[PDB]
């Protein structure tokens, strides 16, 4: 089946509209906090547009008026609140008023968020370095839909001493719960109970077996279900052929993993045919990456052939998705997986990684927000003899508030493309990056990779986790060359340092940039440089003399660097 959405020209098409910082009236002690120079010491460096509303004291509020033609009963809020001294987080709340009537007290926590950097590896307590992941999200449903002209106010109460921050609200109409399909099995048929705080994983496991035995859809009805360990769907020894698992909607069905330990939450698929998983919100009890040993991604392992995971909402996992087989020799692969119409946010590392030879697979029309490593990545690893991943696609996505690495990244293989994306407000990194720094296949047999039709805003950096600059588009020939890449119809707006950056010595071959518009660079004002002599941010920057790149129809405006380009001697740059 096709999960139909009329796509936007660039970015994802979602049912919410945004009520952002400058749309709000502030009062009662609320203040505007901003980081216009992108200084990562400031919490506001991680707010959208580097601006948010601080609610420091009882009575401080941010208030929005619903616009004509907008509204709804589903509200998402991007917020910040302090961590605890021991890094376990604090619990708190904010109050919601509609037209002056108190509607909700929304519980809040900093448990999931806050990661600390004194190296390129995060630490879990404030003693471990400088903070990132300072913002997080919650969502809730109103008893009645907000209507044009309504005012919705977020207000700090007398409950505690904590200073909260509110970045934005996103507001949407919530459809009713999706009906139980005919001749399906439900987790409640096997003892699961919604909303009782009791563990449902035994019932979920039994329901999977019954669905597979009967060939029936597995339905998860509306409500919150609690799973006290990893949900393993099939086993390596007894893999599942085909399975369909459907909830009642991202606003109705919540899967809450309750176990904070390593390898103790998320979903592990052991599927060889087609899985279809949809219409579910999932949350973790995870606050640490466990040094890449968390084994606690939202969706993991064997995704089969022409599978779909669509219309899901997942947050606070190690990664949103990690697609890749580590259990077979030679490795098996997912082929033709489609991830679409989904919200993959606030994870401690990658939003989605297509690894271990994952091929012909796609992430599209999705919101990829506030993740702690590459938003969407293809890592063509080769553990256990996995083949090179080829022909993966990241298109029509809105990728916002990345706080490590890049919004989109390719690390090897052939034929990947990323088109029609909107990439906004990266921190410590790039909208787009490629490198050859990781194990596995690189680009020697790449027939061509394409980036196109993409808008990049407020991205690039002067301070990644190595205290160095990165381009809004960053290409690094770390060991092997970057080869056969085309960028077409890219708008790069208000870049922090340099818009396009090339470096390391592995080589740059057949790199073409067509119809590029660069409007604003060097906006962070930083002049110190990891790689080179001091310089304002440029339109094009290289810190290697080994490479070539060709630009056709380049336009520039508002470039901090007076020379427009800052090219190391030896690099062959053509601009025509
Ligand atoms: Ca659907
Ligand atoms: Ca903002
Ligand atoms: Ca934390
Ligand atoms: Ca239960
Ligand atoms: Ca990563
Ligand atoms: Ca032109
Ligand atoms: Zn489906
Ligand atoms: Zn490590």
Numbering used by the authors: 0 to 575
The authors write:
α-1,3-Glucanases are classified into family 71 and 87 of glycoside hydrolases (GHs) based on their amino acid sequences. GH 87-type α-1,3-glucanase was isolated from the culture filtrate of Bacillus circulans KA-304 and termed Agl-KA. Agl-KA hydrolyses the α-1,3-glucan of oral Streptococci as well as of fungi. Agl-KA is also multimodular, comprising an N-terminal discoidin domain (DS1), followed by a carbohydrate-binding module 6 (CB6), threonine and proline repeats (TP), a second discoidin domain (DS2), an uncharacterised conserved domain (UCD) and a C-terminal catalytic unit (AglΔDCD-UCD).
Five Ca+ ions, two Zn2+ ions, two SO42− molecules and one polyethylene glycol chain were observed within one protein molecule. The overall structure of AglΔDCD-UCD comprised an N-terminal galactose-binding-like domain (~180 residues), followed by a right-handed β-helix (~400 residues), as determined based on the CATH domain classification. Interestingly, a Ca2+ ion is coordinated to the carboxy group of D1067, D1090 and water molecules, with pentagonal–bipyramidal coordination. The β-helix fold creates a concave surface along with the β-helix direction, resulting in a consecutive groove of the putative substrate recognition cleft.
